[PDB]
Swiss-Prot record, chain B:
Function: Forms the portal vertex of the capsid. This portal plays critical roles in head assembly, genome packaging, neck/tail attachment, and genome ejection. The portal protein multimerizes as a single ring-shaped homododecamer arranged around a central channel.
Family: Belongs to the podoviridae portal protein family.
Lineage, opening ranks: Viruses, Duplodnaviria, Heunggongvirae, Uroviricota, Caudoviricetes
Subunit details: Homododecamer. Interacts with major capsid protein. Interacts with the tail tube protein gp11. Interacts with the terminase large subunit. Interacts with the internal virion protein gp14.
Listed name of the protein: Portal protein
Location(s) in or outside the cell: Virion
Residues of the full protein shown: 72 to 213 of 536
Amino acid sequence: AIVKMSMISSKVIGLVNPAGITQPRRLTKAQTGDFVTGRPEDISFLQLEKQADFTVAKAVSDAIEARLSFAFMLNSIRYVASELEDTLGGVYSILSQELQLPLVRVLLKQLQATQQIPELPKEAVEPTISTGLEAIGRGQDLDKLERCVTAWAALAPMRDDPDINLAMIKLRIANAIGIDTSGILLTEEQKQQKMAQQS
Amino acid sequence: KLMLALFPMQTWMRLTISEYEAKQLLSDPDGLAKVDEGLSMVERIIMNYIESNSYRVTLFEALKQLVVAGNVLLYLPEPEGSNYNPMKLYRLSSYVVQRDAFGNVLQMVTRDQIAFGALPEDIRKAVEGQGGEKKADETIDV
Amino acid sequence: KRTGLAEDGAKSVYERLKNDRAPYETRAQNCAQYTIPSLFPKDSDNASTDYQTPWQAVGARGLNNLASKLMLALFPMQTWMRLTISEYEAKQLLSDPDGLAKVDEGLSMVERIIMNYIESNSYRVTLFEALKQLVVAGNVLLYLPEPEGSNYNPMKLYRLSSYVVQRDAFGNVLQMVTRDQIAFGALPEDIRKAVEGQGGEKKADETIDVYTHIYLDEDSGEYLRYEEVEGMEVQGSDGTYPKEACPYIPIRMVRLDGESYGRSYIEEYLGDLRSLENLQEAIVKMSMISSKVIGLVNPAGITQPRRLTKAQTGDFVTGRPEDISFLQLEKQADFTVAKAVSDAIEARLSFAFMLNSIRYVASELEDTLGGVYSILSQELQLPLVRVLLKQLQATQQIPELPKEAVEPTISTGLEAIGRGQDLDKLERCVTAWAALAPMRDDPDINLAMIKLRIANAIGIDTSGILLTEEQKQQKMAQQS
């Protein structure tokens, strides 16, 4: 509607009042200047008076565009998923079970059928957990590991503090983080056997 | 946005081990770390295969089709040597599906118009045998 | 003697297929007319023709900006394809990870040689022209001539009007004919002798039509290529190319099932261009009308223009100011509404053409806006990287001794800009390893375990960079 009103507006028509004295022939057959007989009020141009309707139409169109943009994320990685992209329509979690997992379940088995990713663990089935949000960047294992290693870096000044037990604190903070320290942290037996081997 | 979220540059799938199921049959945690390293290698190889076969373009086309008309069938041909074989995207107009209430029942039929002369050898001989001679231009429905 | 698809002849098939190419030519001509018209002139159009400039003048800017952005993203100055190795399939047939490092170095050397060849042949300008033609009328045929020594041989770009293509629903069936005119002066010797034998006496000026036709072998074969000059082919040109490494590489911007090619990016914004150009033409014509000045003098008054004209500065003249008046274009509100609508159209087109904006101007900017630029990364990039290879490989310009894998190409931009992201995943792990030094004298922890764990978390391959227990043991034993 707005575009068609604009097209209507584009056309120019010269409304000349018959009761007047201005004759368009002498207007057309005249160069720049060239004083001509007539009155300006006689010549008038048709105009599209439909303005308020234009304003209300523009307001409604703006509102519809705003709601659609909010719906299409035009008015906005994990901030490109979890927040925004999984909040403006929860389809990043329904298409992670329809497109992501099925593809990695078929791609892995085919690549096993050929000799490109030989698997022979005999321990587990190595389940695929594509579930992007869950495993966007190999999970939140690097953050946990760096935090626990940084914490272990501290407490170094207080090594010569017989009252406290460094290993106990280290294991307690590891448990608090929830990280697995089966091999990272040497248990009592591991420490004793390492000391014996060192001799 | 969905293509930058679902399928990003960084690994998008993780291979889990279900700890305490492999620990019992394992010598020292170094074995668990080696298992995790092997899983990471498998993930890297999956990245390599997905990127080498131009899967991203087909996935983006499928994603756009899903947004406009949510449905697409992605056929993954069996690997043959190393020559790239991108998944042949099937739009809505080319395939049909049948589902029960649960979706357990599947009956998927895909229609592809390949002109004689480009028909896989087996199909070329099959169509030639069923009838007489097929023009190299006319389309053959498979 | 030619089999199916070629018995009638290259000329006949080209004439037959030209009728199916007409709609694409017409839409390309319309798109060119509303954008820069000189880009895609009509066949009849020739010298002495004036290309009236479009009124809107946003289509030209948008086309130029899209072409520039696509050149910058798809084909940057630095490397834009990465050679893969299919890890752990070579390790089974490889001695030590140092061999993997050497293989990676060789692949990098191959990539550098490809960059050198692409730059030395002015591929950038031809590719820019091809991208612009794709944006205005998405279809181009890029012929890559067989390398000869080291002399420059830029690809011979073929505009839409110079060739035809035939595709089935999949597009597997190809029957490509390219028409080019050579004025009997640059004709290679074989073609010149062929035409001289077929005909009588020719002139060095008159044009000679040369048709190159390639088609699928009727049997389980590859593409058959031959050149037809006038009725009969030339015995010299009997080349045969594999279905994979075809150096003609037809291109399409927007691919639709059934259609053999076309659907330019500007094709689906042609309505916006139409409306904006109509509005701008109306506004400009209104301005031109307003430019004319006419002195409307009321006859009922007493002011006579003759004494007004025959008077110097000052020179008091009898009359009344109200007698003399000038007609004006009072069409003002219409001007406001037309300006508002034209501005809205310009804004939508501008952000659609990226006017109101390597890796950010690509996987973003030229991605969220522009639909798919990754179709030109599988239709232009990969095919060119797969022909440059096997051509530089048939000639002795790149090493040819894989004997491990086929070394796939991941040329497609987003995936490979700057040899992937290996350098970041390496600098991060090296920075992590640089740390943990102060806690080395900590009997509680095993540093190697944390190093391996962080390497696994990053996902980088640590086969050679990090010495495992065994290799460290042999190294220490040998050092003694």
